[PDB]
Amino acid sequence: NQEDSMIMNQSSIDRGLFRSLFFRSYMDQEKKYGMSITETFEKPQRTNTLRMKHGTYDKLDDDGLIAPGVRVSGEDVIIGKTTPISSKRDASTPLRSTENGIVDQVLVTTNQDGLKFVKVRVRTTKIPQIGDKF
Amino acid sequence: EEGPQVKIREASKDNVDFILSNVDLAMANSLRRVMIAEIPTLAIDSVEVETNTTVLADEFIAHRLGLIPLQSMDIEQLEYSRDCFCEDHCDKCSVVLTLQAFGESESTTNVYSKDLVIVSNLMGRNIGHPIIQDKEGNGVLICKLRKGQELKLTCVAKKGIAKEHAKWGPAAAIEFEYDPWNKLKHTDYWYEQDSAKEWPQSKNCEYEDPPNEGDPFDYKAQADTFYMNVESVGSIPVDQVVVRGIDTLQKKVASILLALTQM
Amino acid sequence: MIVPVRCFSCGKVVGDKWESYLNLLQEDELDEGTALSRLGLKRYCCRRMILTHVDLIEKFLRYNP
Amino acid sequence: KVFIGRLPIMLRSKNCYLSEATESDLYKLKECP
Amino acid sequence: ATLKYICAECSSKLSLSRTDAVRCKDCGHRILLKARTKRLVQFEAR
Ligand SMILES: [Zn+2]
Ligand SMILES: [Zn+2]
Ligand SMILES: [Zn+2]
User: Where does the UniProt annotation locate this protein (chain D)?
Assistant: First the structure.
């Protein structure tokens, strides 16, 4: 506890002492080229272009998304977007490398243009650590 | 009769107010230490979600569920899950529970520990039955459900101690006190003007006797007279928090002689 | 955000005693002081648990799904 | 007669919906009171 | 059973093909959530 620091009762943290939560959102759209060429929202796999990310696509369903409630890991795909060029480049968006957690809400709407908007949430239980600020 | 002896002052269902004399300061402390953690307890560990909707998240509700005290009587007849040979959990090491609630009522629907169901067969040992301190018979308020808030679960109850996590805490806060009349000089009493004139003389002080100034400093004095109040969770009935405590304090000693002989 | 199952410093099952504290004042017209003690709140650790907590859960229940 | 520019509106303001809407209407509008 | 998508407001099951109108089939609203990942989620009690 010297030069400003402090000791903590873990057998108390265990009950709910300074137990918290933290929720992160993710954004992406079904971006249009004009000539009715749109990025595809699904689960891409190699074939023609193979310009893809390295994470786990395997967790996502076939609407190019994980349904909320699944345990996300680290660098695994959360957003499945395929880039058509003149096939399967790819512009999929994965989990932030640092983070971990569970999917909270998988929101999908239409923008002012009507482009398949995605809003995924990453629900983590931040617990008192050996060097957290208080 | 024998060595260090007991003086039960008050007896109840969650408090054993007694006095311990002839014991070493250390022997008194080493049990107060043992009672807080190293006593086997059954409390949920692997909480499995089927469908959730509550205002609390998947792992939110899951944390509180392990904190629910369950009957821990014949816990020394069901081994630690780990020590069994099954695929994770079975009757030998675990007694599984479930909880299937839904916000039916137009009003709020309070999930209580009474709503829990012992699915995995108990095989004939008092265990997995929550501690209901409620008048209404409810016991341990889990959450609140409004509309179609459905909480479909699968809660596994394994063995464990508070050294692992306090949810297996067999006790709450054990009271510890000795040498009320400080004739052992165990404390440099703080005062602006006068010591006892500013410091309140303890309850447990009506059991030792006045110092009397016409006496020297008790240089030959040593500490006994251990005034303790044992606050039980109710998971283990009061007496066993003490008994299965003393017993498990001996086991760790007997383990050392055992280790000395393989050596 | 709802009753903590058990106190932090001690570990006494505070969980159930919420639905019993709410009425103890609403109904019995009592003060918080004797109402906390009427449940069995001796030491301040358990006292601060029931007293200085807010059941935010109800404000969240006031929504749709 | 003729429209000119889409001007953002302040939350709980003049032409804003929130301002008038009650606690119940808020817990219904899925907006925090 | 068979609920790929869900509405936030009225709360009504949907499911639509890749480009088959992001619209709840009662209230105009384009909103919607993606429902439960049926698969059982085991946890910790700590
Ligand atoms: Zn087993
Ligand atoms: Zn306490
Ligand atoms: Zn709708």
Answer: Nucleus
Give helix B239-262 / helix B25-36 axis angle, nearest 10°: 110
B197 Cβ contact partners less than 8 Å away, ≥ 6 residues apart: B191
The token pair at B45 is 């560990």
- Where does B41-166 sit in CATH, by number? 2.170.120.12
Q: Which fold has domain C1-65?
A: Arc Repressor Mutant, subunit A (1.10.10)
- CATH fold label, A20-127: OB fold (Dihydrolipoamide Acetyltransferase, E2P) (2.40.50)
Please name the residues in contact with A3: beta carbons below 8 A apart, sequence gap of 6 or more: none
Consecutive H or E run containing B55: none
How far apart CA B111 and CA B144 sit, in angstroms, is 6
- Residue A7 near chain C (CB below 8 Å): no
**Best of C3, C7, C8, C14 to disrupt the A interface by mutation (most A CBs within 10 Å)?**
C8
What method was applied to determine this entry?
A: X-ray
Q: How far apart are CA B55 and CA B246, in angstroms?
A: 43
* Residues of A with a known catalytic role: 4
**What's the CA gap between E46 and B67, in Å, rounded?**
8
Distances (CA, A) of A79 to A110, B127, B174, B222, C62: 16, 46, 53, 71, 32
- CATH number, residue E40: 2.20.28.30
Count of structural domains within chain E: 1
Domain B2-40+167-263 indexed as CATH 3.40.50.300: no
* E7 marked as part of a ligand binding site: yes
Q: Residues E12-40, buried b or exposed e (16+ Cβ, 10 A)?
A: eebeeeeeeebbbeeeeeebbbbbbbeee
What is the Å distance from ligand 3's center to E13 Cα? Answer: 9
For residue C13, how far is its CA from the centre of ligand 2 (angstroms)? 9
The distance of C25 to chain B (nearest Cα, Å) reads: 17
Residue whose pair of structure tokens reads 């059973």 in the numeric block = E1
Distance from CA of D18 to the nearest CA of C (A): 16
